[PDB]
From Swiss-Prot:
Lineage of source species: Eukaryota, Metazoa, Chordata, Craniata, Vertebrata
Keyword Signal belongs to the record: yes
Bridged cysteine pairs (disulfide): 6-128, 30-116, 65-81, 77-95
SMART domains (alphabetical): LYZ1 (SM00263)
Name by which UniProt lists this protein: Lysozyme C
Organism: Homo sapiens (Human)
Amino acid sequence: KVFERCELARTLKRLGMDGYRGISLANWMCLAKWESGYNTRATNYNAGDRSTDYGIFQINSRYWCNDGKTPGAVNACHLSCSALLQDNIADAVACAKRVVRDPQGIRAWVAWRNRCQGRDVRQYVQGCGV
């Protein structure tokens, strides 16, 4: 599924992401936008290390989900990576929360650092009623 901007903002709010571990809803929006274009079925293979990024937040298989084909990987979210490709983003959100529970927090995603950190991200939630 490819979410509409405000549709996703309300969906994320309902899932308890607004201010999760100090991260505003606008930041999560900026993250999903740059990571996948709000596309839950987006996948990205990293030929360089044999891992794959899955779903709306493009979560990596080396540490977060299990896909059976990533060398010496773990599964912190304790989910099949398939779970990160559903139209229903409840599991992906649960996993994203797990990711930010680590020290880096939202900084875990380099794209967030490049296109969200230190910027005016209000635009992502404007008019959404969140």
